[PDB]
Structure 1
Amino acid sequence: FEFPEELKTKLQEHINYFPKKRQAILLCLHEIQNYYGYIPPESLKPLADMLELPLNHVEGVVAFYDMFDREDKAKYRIRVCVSIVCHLMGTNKLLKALENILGIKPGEVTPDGKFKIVPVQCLGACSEAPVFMVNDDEYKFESEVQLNEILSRYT
């Protein structure tokens, strides 16, 4: 496994940003996931080499942080808050609307690999409950008609 030049230069930028190389580990993993749609297990050894860290340190970090996914490749991660406020205000209505539009449940990926529903804890936008994200974009769920129009923007 070798990182493509375009990705390798971005990883090098994160590594040169902090006073110590190892501090860039989360920024680098965020970059790897953005590029591939997941964390390829084969990418961990060349990243560990770039950060000057043992492979098991990098493996332990990927396993600890919930945003990182080593199993499913997805173009768009639909992060659905399942915490207390969103639950009270309508998470189940948002999850039913996602099932009606995409045919998938939390933890599943669409057959085309376009969307994955990721249940998450409080997203810190509780006054706008029920909350969801589509990769970096965040929204309040209003209705299935409103949600359908939002999802059509992700090609």
Structure 2
Amino acid sequence: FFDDKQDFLEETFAKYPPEGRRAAIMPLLRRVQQEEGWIRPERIEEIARLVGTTPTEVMGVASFYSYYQFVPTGKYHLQVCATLSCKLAGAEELWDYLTETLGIGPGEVTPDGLFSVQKVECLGSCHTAPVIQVNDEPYVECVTRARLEALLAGLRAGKRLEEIELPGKCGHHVHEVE
């Protein structure tokens, strides 16, 4: 996998010391993900050899974090914030609707192969709850029941997310409710 792109390797090993190579495990793992959607056990063996350690040591490290998926994930992996602050905004309800509409649990993927779901912890935009982070790009904040369905059909008709039109308005570091 990394044979292809060794410009990425020189560059990212160069941020850490000679004796600080495992450091690379995180950024490498991270790539595989944003490229292939999930990490296969062949990637873990590679990365181990690349970074200079055992398959065992890398395996553990990667299974420690929440973002790395180790089974396939639909085109748009919907990560929903469940933590308190978003709870008081409607998070649980939104999860019940979303999951019940699409008919998927965390480990599954919709039949049409573009929708995975996951509950996550505070995304750190509590002032704009309920919050949703798509794949690895800017949150979709203030997911009202209506704001949501539009997000859904936007992606469902192949609109690249960075330019779907969302009803209503949502502030920056401060947010006014009505």
TM-score, normalized by the shorter chain, greater than 0.5: yes
Alpha-carbon distance in 1 for matches of 2:86, 2:120: 11
- Please tell me whether the aligned partners of residues 95 and 105 of structure 1 are also in contact (alpha carbons under 8 angstroms): no
Deviation at 1:99, TM superposition (A): 3.3
- The residue number in structure 2 matching 1:99 is 99
* Count of aligned pairs between the two proteins: 153
- The residue number in structure 1 matching 2:116 is 116
Alpha-carbon distance in 1 for matches of 2:36, 2:10: 17
- The residue number in structure 2 matching 1:53 is 53
Unpaired runs of at least 5, structure 2: 159-178
AA of the residue aligned to 2:35: Y
AA of the residue aligned to 1:122: C
- Please tell me whether the aligned partners of residues 130 and 141 of structure 1 are also in contact (alpha carbons under 8 angstroms): yes
Q: SS of the counterpart of 2:23? A: helix
- The residue number in structure 1 matching 2:15 is 17
- The residue number in structure 2 matching 1:150 is 151
Q: SS of the counterpart of 1:64? A: coil
Higher RCO (C-alpha 8 Å, min separation 6): 1
Q: Which has the higher helix share?
A: 1
Deviation at 1:92, TM superposition (A): 2.2
- The residue number in structure 1 matching 2:161 is none
Alpha-carbon distance in 2 for matches of 1:10, 1:118: 29
- Please tell me whether the aligned partners of residues 130 and 144 of structure 2 are also in contact (alpha carbons under 8 angstroms): no
Residues 120, 11 of structure 1: alpha-carbon distance in 2 compared, 3 angstrom cutoff: farther
Unpaired runs of at least 5, structure 1: none
* Of 115-124 and 91-100, the range deviating more from structure 2: 91-100
Deviation at 1:13, TM superposition (A): 3.1
Alignment deviations for residues 123-143 of structure 1 (CA, whole Å, 9 cap, x no partner): 111111111101122022343
What is the RMSD computed on CA atoms of the aligned residues?
A: 2.2
Q: TM-score, normalised by structure 2?
A: 0.74
AA of the residue aligned to 2:85: V
Alpha-carbon distance in 2 for matches of 1:115, 1:4: 31
Deviation at 1:74, TM superposition (A): 2.8
* Of 135-144 and 75-84, the range deviating more from structure 2: 135-144
Task: Return the index of the structure with the highest Cα Rg.
Answer: 2
- Please tell me whether the aligned partners of residues 73 and 115 of structure 2 are also in contact (alpha carbons under 8 angstroms): no
